[PDB]
Symmetry: C3
Subunit: 429 residues, 3 copies
Amino acid sequence: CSLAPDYQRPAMPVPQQFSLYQNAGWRTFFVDNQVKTLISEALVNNRDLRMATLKVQEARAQYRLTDADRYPQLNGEGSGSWSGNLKGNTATTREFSTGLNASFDLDFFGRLKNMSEAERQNYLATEEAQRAVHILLVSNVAQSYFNQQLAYAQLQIAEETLRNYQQSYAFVEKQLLTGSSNVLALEQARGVIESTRSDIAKRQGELAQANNALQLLLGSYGKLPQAQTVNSDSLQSVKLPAGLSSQILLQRPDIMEAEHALMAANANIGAARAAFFPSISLTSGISTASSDLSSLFNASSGMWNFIPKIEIPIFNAGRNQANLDIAEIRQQQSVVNYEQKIQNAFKEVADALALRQSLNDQISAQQRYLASLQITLQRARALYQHGAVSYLEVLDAERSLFATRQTLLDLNYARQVNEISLYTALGGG
Amino acid sequence: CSLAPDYQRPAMPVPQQFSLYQNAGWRTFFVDNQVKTLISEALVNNRDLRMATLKVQEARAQYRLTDADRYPQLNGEGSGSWSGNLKGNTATTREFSTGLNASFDLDFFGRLKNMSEAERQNYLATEEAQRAVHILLVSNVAQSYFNQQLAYAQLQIAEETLRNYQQSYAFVEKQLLTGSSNVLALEQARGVIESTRSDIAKRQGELAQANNALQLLLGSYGKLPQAQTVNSDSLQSVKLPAGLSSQILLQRPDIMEAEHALMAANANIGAARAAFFPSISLTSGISTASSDLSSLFNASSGMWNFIPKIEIPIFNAGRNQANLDIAEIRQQQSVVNYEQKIQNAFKEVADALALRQSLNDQISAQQRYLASLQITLQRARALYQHGAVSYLEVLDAERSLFATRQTLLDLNYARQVNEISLYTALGGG
Amino acid sequence: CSLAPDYQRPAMPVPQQFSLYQNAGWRTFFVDNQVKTLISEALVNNRDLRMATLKVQEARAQYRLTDADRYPQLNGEGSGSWSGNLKGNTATTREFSTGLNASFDLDFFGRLKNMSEAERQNYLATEEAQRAVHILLVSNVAQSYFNQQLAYAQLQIAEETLRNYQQSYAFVEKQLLTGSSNVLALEQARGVIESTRSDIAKRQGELAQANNALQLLLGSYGKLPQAQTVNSDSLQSVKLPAGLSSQILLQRPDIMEAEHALMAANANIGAARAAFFPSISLTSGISTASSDLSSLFNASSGMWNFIPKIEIPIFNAGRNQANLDIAEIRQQQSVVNYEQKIQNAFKEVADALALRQSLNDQISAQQRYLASLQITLQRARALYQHGAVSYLEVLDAERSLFATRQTLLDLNYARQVNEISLYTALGGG
Ligand SMILES: CCCCCC(=O)O[C@@H](C)COC(=O)CCCC
Ligand SMILES: CCCCCC(=O)O[C@@H](C)COC(=O)CCCC
Ligand SMILES: CCCCCC(=O)O[C@@H](C)COC(=O)CCCC
């Protein structure tokens, strides 16, 4: 029988709602087929995921190892013994013996049963850990793909901007050969060409970095995607009901992992309690003994045996009690671990929801800012050509425009990352 | 008796002074009452601190478990034995036996005593670890509160700046309807409104983030503080004597933790040394034996027993010596661990003192910069209205002003964080 | 004999080349003598390296501990036994005994041999870990030195820039006292002086930070280097053949560490396999027994003994098989660990090579940008003095110039760091 306490799910340590559903699979969540191809390759070759899988196998074997202690054993033994007096009759006594021994712990109070159940729960927790590694890998690959696509997009506008600046310089140069511009404007036009070449070199380096990070996550080194067209339709951003229960968090593999670890600590309390009670064992066997080897296996030399035994703990100066205290305190730690995983998960979902609002409003404002900067640039150019303002008006407007284009690219990436984090924080596929 | 070496505090591995006192309690250090209310709530509900507390309880129980091995034990045993020949007289021999056994390890050379003292020192080290978690929690809550207050303050000036920009745009619009301004100026005024809306969205997102981080640290989800007025009087920044001894570092809980771990390794050397010496044990008991169950508890079937025993290690191919080497090397590692904690602590205090100077001088300079930018803006506006300069003068001055206001807010926050880190690095309350 | 499988190096989990040699020692790689002096001091006093060294000693002792189990043991035992009936003849029986016992496990199937070989491989892996700590320390000290030198260089140009701004302000002030300038220009000139004072305070703080980080790495607190002249000749940047084999990665200590850990897991499979086979042991000794103490050591009371013994596992409900499964799965994990270290190392080299290209091209572009900005500033000043443009032209050009000088310093530092990381990623000295 078992002395373990019944499992009771701890109270939810977070609010009932995220303020004021089930995730699609990742093959539906991701629309972009290039990112899905990368995800499937990583699932096959990624070494972190492979390690996590092997840890599940190890835990299953550790369970089987512990479960084996519940079953009878059968072992053999053989011995030869020579001995004699150091003085007097110095004649040698010789005896050979043989044993075939069966052994069985009856486990009436469920000590071995619960040590086995603890290890089975560690195995279950380890499968959930593997599932967490799995959904984090999907998330990480996707983010790295959008980072690569960000580098391509930044590189593209850097190169377009370089061409624009070269055309401007050519124009100022022509104007100068007619007294229409001065050497200050020429030099201002000349400088931004060089700063833009620096930006191109930066974005080329970011692309190479993005590629190397991708190959590490994939665990394979074949061709990587070229520049793609990526936008807010590249994923199916999650649509959550207004009054979404935080109970959806309990679906996350990291939370399920903590729950099984808690069930393991419950089983360990059971094993600790059983130490106070008597333990009953049974040994039974066949034996032989003979002073000579030839008649060692003769039935005439043989015996059978059957010995049931009981051990009874009476006073142990608090060994058993300290051991139980440890098991109960570790169970309390497992409860707290479970609460920490839920509070952390709640914070992840809450932050992603707030960042979602943030990024959509920044992106909308930056798009309108960009439109105004385009108009400013066009108006500055007209006024500059007619000698009504200095070339600093054109430079200032050009610089701001290019800066805002880069910022807008970065914000759209952040939005992709956040949509992926939200999906993953809700448990992924 | 004990073979452990006497404890000797390692030499201070850092300078005597921080270049060229006792901390108040945190209820005195913090003036702002809102942050103190948050700290008290976190002390009750924070899960990290609760875990640390449970680890102290576990360590206390592990100590009690190990101490129990020093005391006599009393246990009972019962057995039934059936056996017989496989050939010849196949008649079954039957014997029942009973044992009440006392056991005692005399521990003359202090092996069990020192294994117990090591575990007591682990318990003491674990209490200090709990105290470190405690003062770090106070520090972390306070920093998160000032981060929240920074978000409110950034949001406020972003909204004020938006209003300013809207008033400017309205003015340029009126001027345009009278031929007094041109479409370039109108568009420049229009654009910064949109960039400022992007900043508002950013600061709203930072506020929400700040709030979620706060609730995670608190472990509770009630109302959070609204915007407060926060300044350099919100804490009582520490006043340190010019020639402050680095010996104040030895008060830090992380350093006290390392010291007890070192005392534990000393005890372990004692336990390892005792392995070379004889061990004396004592067993004493009452027993019965009978071929039938009914006379099993008869005094006629009973005996008493008293068996003192000595085991003497002679040659073990260097098992004992390798084990001692391990204990001595681990003690040396504990010394190095202690030195690492002190060198790290010194670096934390030294950095905070340098950052203190840095931030006060940056803040003073930025305040004077801000005053100059205000004047520049006013002068640019006058000149612009009189047609003496382009609207770029107004835009440039407006942009710089808003940027410097944000920087100044960020510097004052950094100063708060640094004052809190210094206080905590000196051991906190 | 041994049942361990032969070691087979896993296939290279990365490409054959880095796209499309041996490192010099660090005393040749580093030219700057100041950084080499710092490296030598850290090698002596750094606490992390000292800890790593002590872990090698501990592992060597653990090996010696495990190896000792392969050798015969000799131990002594002494006993006194008093006993008697609880009823009837209540006369006390007394017996004293003595034992000198030799013991030897023959280890025919290599269980103890392989447990010893596993521990020797852990020792070898630990020496490699120490070597990794060593080359990382060299890298970290060097990077911290160049960070310190960056702070000095940033501080220097900040102070030079302050002087420039003060001279400009003085000039605008003189012009104002003659009606030649207006109060807007005066205030613009005044403001940048104050922003530059903020930058000086920042760079002084960065210098102090750099110094404290350096002393922590050194483990000593003597004088630190003053400002030096540092450039691309300060190190001998590695020159790699076009078709460099990725096999150079297998020289890295972290990879060699993983390989020995894999050899340890191979030995553990051998130990696990031996559990299925019989184990043969031998005990031999001298004993005495006497009812009185005086004749306890008499040869007349003595005996000699010789007892060889065999234990034979037959059925254990899968205990042995689960244990073997665990060893085989852990070996598979060790293979994966080895592959992870190589894939990570490849990524480090690949990134450094890409960053090298990036930084050289950014630095070249920024130098040309700087040259253009100098010319722009000179042209703006001339035009401003002649009343042809506003002072905003001078301010804009001054601000950009100072920003680009700081960026260029930061890029040259990044290049130093990257050259050091590449060298270290290739295995260091
Ligand atoms: C034998 C009828 C009892 C039914 C309850 C139940 O199965 O629990 C068992 C394990 C407890 O008793 C025990 O087995 C006691 C044995 C050692 C003294
Ligand atoms: C008996 C008088 C000695 C006083 C010193 C002291 O108390 O230390 C003890 C532990 C060492 O001797 C031992 O107990 C030796 C016992 C095993 C051979
Ligand atoms: C005795 C000749 C065999 C040569 C092969 C070799 O040395 O391997 C040994 C270890 C295996 O046999 C064993 O020692 C068997 C002993 C236990 C039943």
